Write an enzyme that holds these catalytic residues in place. Structure first.
Site, PDB file in Angstrom:
ATOM      1  CG  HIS A  70      -2.020  -1.090   1.084  1.00  0.00           C
ATOM      2  ND1 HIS A  70      -1.987  -2.228   1.863  1.00  0.00           N
ATOM      3  CD2 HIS A  70      -3.134  -1.189   0.322  1.00  0.00           C
ATOM      4  CE1 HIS A  70      -3.040  -2.979   1.586  1.00  0.00           C
ATOM      5  NE2 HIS A  70      -3.746  -2.376   0.649  1.00  0.00           N
ATOM      6  CG  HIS A  74      -1.566   0.273  -4.295  1.00  0.00           C
ATOM      7  ND1 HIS A  74      -2.208  -0.597  -5.145  1.00  0.00           N
ATOM      8  CD2 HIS A  74      -2.475   0.627  -3.360  1.00  0.00           C
ATOM      9  CE1 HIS A  74      -3.457  -0.755  -4.747  1.00  0.00           C
ATOM     10  NE2 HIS A  74      -3.644  -0.025  -3.662  1.00  0.00           N
ATOM     11  CG  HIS A 108      -6.752   4.368  -3.059  1.00  0.00           C
ATOM     12  ND1 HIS A 108      -5.761   4.344  -4.017  1.00  0.00           N
ATOM     13  CD2 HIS A 108      -6.817   3.114  -2.551  1.00  0.00           C
ATOM     14  CE1 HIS A 108      -5.246   3.129  -4.082  1.00  0.00           C
ATOM     15  NE2 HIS A 108      -5.870   2.363  -3.204  1.00  0.00           N
ATOM     16  CG  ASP A 219      -7.695  -0.836  -3.994  1.00  0.00           C
ATOM     17  OD1 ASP A 219      -6.567  -0.337  -4.090  1.00  0.00           O
ATOM     18  OD2 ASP A 219      -8.189  -1.156  -2.902  1.00  0.00           O
ATOM     19  CD  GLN A 271      -3.683 -14.395  -5.277  1.00  0.00           C
ATOM     20  OE1 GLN A 271      -3.683 -13.691  -6.285  1.00  0.00           O
ATOM     21  NE2 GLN A 271      -4.035 -13.936  -4.079  1.00  0.00           N
TER      22      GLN A 271
HETATM   23  C1  AXC Z   1      -3.568 -10.148  -5.957  1.00  0.00           C
HETATM   24  C2  AXC Z   1      -4.424  -9.897  -4.722  1.00  0.00           C
HETATM   25  N1  AXC Z   1      -4.982  -8.736  -4.402  1.00  0.00           N
HETATM   26  C3  AXC Z   1      -5.619  -8.980  -3.265  1.00  0.00           C
HETATM   27  C4  AXC Z   1      -6.393  -8.204  -2.408  1.00  0.00           C
HETATM   28  C5  AXC Z   1      -6.620  -6.859  -2.694  1.00  0.00           C
HETATM   29  C6  AXC Z   1      -7.396  -6.086  -1.836  1.00  0.00           C
HETATM   30  C7  AXC Z   1      -7.945  -6.665  -0.691  1.00  0.00           C
HETATM   31  C8  AXC Z   1      -7.716  -8.014  -0.407  1.00  0.00           C
HETATM   32  C9  AXC Z   1      -6.937  -8.790  -1.260  1.00  0.00           C
HETATM   33  N2  AXC Z   1      -6.724 -10.090  -0.974  1.00  0.00           N
HETATM   34  C10 AXC Z   1      -5.978 -10.863  -1.785  1.00  0.00           C
HETATM   35  S1  AXC Z   1      -5.667 -12.542  -1.459  1.00  0.00           S
HETATM   36  C11 AXC Z   1      -6.537 -12.861   0.128  1.00  0.00           C
HETATM   37  C12 AXC Z   1      -8.019 -13.192  -0.081  1.00  0.00           C
HETATM   38  N3  AXC Z   1      -8.501 -14.344  -0.548  1.00  0.00           N
HETATM   39  C13 AXC Z   1      -9.827 -14.249  -0.602  1.00  0.00           C
HETATM   40  C14 AXC Z   1     -10.810 -15.138  -1.007  1.00  0.00           C
HETATM   41  C15 AXC Z   1     -12.145 -14.751  -0.941  1.00  0.00           C
HETATM   42  C16 AXC Z   1     -12.492 -13.481  -0.472  1.00  0.00           C
HETATM   43  C17 AXC Z   1     -11.500 -12.594  -0.066  1.00  0.00           C
HETATM   44  C18 AXC Z   1     -10.168 -12.988  -0.136  1.00  0.00           C
HETATM   45  N4  AXC Z   1      -9.038 -12.366   0.175  1.00  0.00           N
HETATM   46  N5  AXC Z   1      -5.410 -10.326  -2.951  1.00  0.00           N
HETATM   47  N6  AXC Z   1      -4.708 -10.833  -3.825  1.00  0.00           N
HETATM   48 MG    MG Z   2      -6.853   0.819   0.828  1.00  0.00          MG
HETATM   49 ZN    ZN Z   3      -5.487   0.519  -2.535  1.00  0.00          ZN
END
Ligand code: AXC
Ligand code: MG
Ligand code: ZN
Length: 314
Positions: A70, A74, A108, A219, A271
């Site tokens: 963050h 980003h 943000h 985002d 993922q």
């Molecule tokens: C590449 C990426 N970006 C994010 C991300 C971005 C913003 C907020 C949370 C984020 N979480 C992840 S991976 C962890 C995750 N796996 C999930 C499965 C279902 C619902 C939410 C989840 N967060 N990841 N993975």
């Molecule tokens: Mg944020």
């Molecule tokens: Zn952000």
């Protein structure tokens, strides 16, 4: 900011900056100038005072911390994705919205400390006392207003009061919408509205919901970059998750799995869940409402099947 005033984008970047998949990573020294460029191309050369804008940009830069994910990089990555969205859907939005949304994307995650909202809630961080929901996102906005009100930084000085407070509301809403906890409700409503044909961008409430989804789409855009850039930005994300999980282990508290560096076998599967539950859904609904943004969904799908290859060792 002196150098930023006489900065110029190389003609090669002018072509590629317009593309959704464009990856800013390799041009660190140009990031502030890339943002200036994007604001001029979308909002015009004539609306922002060059000097005040450049000062505001560098103060935004200075108030992002060196955390794994963050961070300044980003901020600009999210600004760019919005640029391409705005550029492909230009006249669906007003001039004031594009002004507010590009700034909002840059601002943000201002002063992000590398901790989630749940961490701050659970350990009674002061900020959790002031802000009981969307804690950091409310801080990020309050941080935006604080920079804006600095000497020479008020890039919205040439606006009427009505317009000034209009653009603060576009911004505040847009920053709050980056709280992923709000996205899930937002998307399901937008999906229903589109599927029943009730959706109407002239309806303000609807309009705020579309903007919110645009902010989410922005985002998360590291899942729409080319596989190797996507991979790389996933390291940055989990690096910050593990840092936070570690702080909990110091307090003898087992963290959630995505923040546990001893559970990183589960990443590929994590993922997969994220693309199915969050990312694919986001760009699917976004593509239904703003068809010119399909390449985001296209690249997201490509990367899902990449994480699918990994799971079965390929
Ligand atoms: C590449 C990426 N970006 C994010 C991300 C971005 C913003 C907020 C949370 C984020 N979480 C992840 S991976 C962890 C995750 N796996 C999930 C499965 C279902 C619902 C939410 C989840 N967060 N990841 N993975
Ligand atoms: Mg944020
Ligand atoms: Zn952000």
């Amino acid at each position: 900011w002196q150098g930023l005033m006489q900065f110029t984008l190389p003609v090669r970047l002018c072509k590629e900056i317009e593309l959704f998949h464009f990856d800013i990573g390799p041009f660190e020294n140009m990031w502030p100038g890339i943002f200036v460029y994007m604001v001029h191309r979308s909002c015009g050369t004539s609306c922002f005072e060059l000097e005040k804008l450049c000062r505001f940009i560098m103060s935004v830069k200075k108030n992002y911390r060196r955390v794994p994910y963050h961070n300044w990089k980003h901020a600009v990555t999210v600004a760019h994705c919005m640029y391409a969205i705005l550029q492909n859907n230009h006249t669906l939005f007003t001039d004031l919205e594009r002004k507010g949304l590009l700034i909002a994307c840059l601002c943000h995650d201002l002063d992000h400390r590398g901790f989630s909202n749940s961490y701050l809630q659970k350990f009674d961080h002061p900020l959790a006392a002031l802000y009981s929901t969307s804690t950091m996102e409310q801080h990020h906005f309050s941080q935006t207003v604080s920079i804006l009100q600095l000497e020479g930084h008020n890039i919205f000085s040439t606006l009427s009061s009505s317009e000034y407070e209009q653009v603060l509301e576009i911004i505040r809403k847009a920053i709050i919408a980056t709280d992923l906890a709000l996205y899930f409700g937002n998307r399901k409503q937008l999906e229903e509205m589109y599927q029943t044909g009730s959706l109407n961008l002239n309806n303000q409430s609807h309009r705020d919901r579309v903007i919110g989804l645009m902010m989410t789409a922005c985002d998360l855009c590291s899942v729409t970059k080319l596989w190797p850039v996507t991979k790389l930005t996933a390291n940055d994300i989990y690096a910050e998750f593990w840092a936070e999980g570690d702080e909990m282990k110091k307090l003898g508290i087992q963290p959630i799995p995505m923040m546990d560096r001893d559970k990183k076998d589960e990443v590929p599967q994590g993922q997969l869940g994220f693309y199915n539950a969050v990312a694919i859904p986001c760009y699917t609904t976004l593509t239904q409402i703003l068809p010119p943004t399909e390449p985001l969904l296209k690249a997201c799908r490509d990367n899902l099947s990449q994480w699918e290859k990994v799971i079965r060792g390929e």
